[PDB]
Design an enzyme around this catalytic site. Sequence first.
Site, PDB file in Angstrom:
ATOM      1  N   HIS A   1      16.866  80.166  64.133  1.00 29.86           N
ATOM      2  CA  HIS A   1      16.750  81.622  63.912  1.00 29.86           C
ATOM      3  C   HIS A   1      15.477  82.267  64.407  1.00 29.86           C
ATOM      4  O   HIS A   1      14.477  81.605  64.625  1.00 29.86           O
ATOM      5  CB  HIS A   1      16.773  81.960  62.381  1.00 29.86           C
ATOM      6  CG  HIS A   1      17.711  81.128  61.568  1.00 29.86           C
ATOM      7  ND1 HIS A   1      17.277  80.171  60.671  1.00 29.86           N
ATOM      8  CD2 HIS A   1      19.061  81.079  61.541  1.00 29.86           C
ATOM      9  CE1 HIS A   1      18.322  79.569  60.134  1.00 29.86           C
ATOM     10  NE2 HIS A   1      19.413  80.102  60.646  1.00 29.86           N
TER      11      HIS A   1
ATOM     12  N   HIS B   1      12.561  84.471  63.135  1.00 30.70           N
ATOM     13  CA  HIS B   1      11.897  84.819  61.886  1.00 30.70           C
ATOM     14  C   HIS B   1      11.005  86.044  62.123  1.00 30.70           C
ATOM     15  O   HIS B   1      10.586  86.324  63.257  1.00 30.70           O
ATOM     16  CB  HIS B   1      11.133  83.627  61.297  1.00 30.70           C
ATOM     17  CG  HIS B   1      12.033  82.623  60.668  1.00 30.70           C
ATOM     18  ND1 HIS B   1      11.889  82.207  59.366  1.00 30.70           N
ATOM     19  CD2 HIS B   1      13.095  81.947  61.169  1.00 30.70           C
ATOM     20  CE1 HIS B   1      12.817  81.306  59.094  1.00 30.70           C
ATOM     21  NE2 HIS B   1      13.561  81.129  60.175  1.00 30.70           N
TER      22      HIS B   1
ATOM     23  N   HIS C   1      21.791  88.758  59.873  1.00 31.36           N
ATOM     24  CA  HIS C   1      20.429  89.150  60.147  1.00 31.36           C
ATOM     25  C   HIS C   1      20.356  89.214  61.679  1.00 31.36           C
ATOM     26  O   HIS C   1      21.070  88.494  62.370  1.00 31.36           O
ATOM     27  CB  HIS C   1      19.489  88.056  59.660  1.00 31.36           C
ATOM     28  CG  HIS C   1      19.499  87.881  58.171  1.00 31.36           C
ATOM     29  ND1 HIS C   1      19.245  86.671  57.555  1.00 31.36           N
ATOM     30  CD2 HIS C   1      19.683  88.777  57.174  1.00 31.36           C
ATOM     31  CE1 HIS C   1      19.271  86.829  56.244  1.00 31.36           C
ATOM     32  NE2 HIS C   1      19.532  88.100  55.988  1.00 31.36           N
TER      33      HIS C   1
HETATM   34 CU    CU Z   1      15.293  79.979  60.068  1.00 32.51          CU
HETATM   35 ZN    ZN Z   2      19.576  84.691  58.472  1.00 34.57          ZN
END
Ligand code: CU
Ligand code: ZN
Lengths: 153, 153
Positions: B46, B48, B80
């Site tokens: 991901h 961040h 997200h």
């Molecule tokens: Cu992460």
């Molecule tokens: Zn997430």
Amino acid sequence: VQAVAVLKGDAGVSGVVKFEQASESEPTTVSYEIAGNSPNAERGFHIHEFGDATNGCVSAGPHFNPFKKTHGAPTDEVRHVGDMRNVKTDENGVAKGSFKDSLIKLIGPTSVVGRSVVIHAGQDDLGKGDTEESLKTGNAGPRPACGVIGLTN
Amino acid sequence: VQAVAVLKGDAGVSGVVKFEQASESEPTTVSYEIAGNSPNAERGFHIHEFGDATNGCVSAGPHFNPFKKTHGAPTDEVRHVGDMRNVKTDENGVAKGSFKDSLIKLIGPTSVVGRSVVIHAGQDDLGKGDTEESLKTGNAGPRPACGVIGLTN
Ligand SMILES: [Cu+2]
Ligand SMILES: [Zn+2]
Ligand SMILES: [Cu+2]
Ligand SMILES: [Zn+2]
């Protein structure tokens, strides 16, 4: 707005550089703590173009210079946006301090977020040397440590 | 526009993540090469919030989530911005691949330049777990390596 660069390398030099700017037209406050430098010396300290760490400190590229000016002292009108003062090192090889700067920004088209900070092994001649190299890098020499500038809070 | 994150840590995991975006409304092409992972596995991957490396991978903060949505799969509308697919690792623990993404951008108010990429020690449940934690992190677990996203060319 806040940003930070963690300076790392394989030469014994390391540190943390913090940046703070309230709004685009205001000065950015740059503060730093750097260890492992030659003691009682002056070391070149600049914002380099790229936040690219794929090749040590080499991939950082040249000094951030969007306005295509020559290398100069922080107080010179003609300087690279990335031209910061030489950092003075104490008897233990530690550089610690802070200053305000009006060309360095964390906001707008010339933002240094995503770029790099480089601490040099040599003193920066502030563009006053008798060479073409002085007008490019200040003859600051090797790049023992560097760090990509990221956003923080 | 191009950007890159060099993933480092103390857990044996390391890599390079490349980003490319032509213009703000177009997809960003994310490509990666990551070594040292568990073999034949799926690992959370991901963007961040912070490009802050002062505290290992901890200071990167939570998943970049400007729209205040819950954690989801890359193809979910509710996710997200930083939610990328689990990266699959081969028999040698290597993850290599690339994909296009429409929420991740290198341009505009949601730019990931100056933020961080984190590779996890565990599999991301894509927000489908039976816990509140699933909707926050996908229960992806520890952060063996991470890197601040900088501008390159
Ligand atoms: Cu992460
Ligand atoms: Zn997430
Ligand atoms: Cu320099
Ligand atoms: Zn310069």
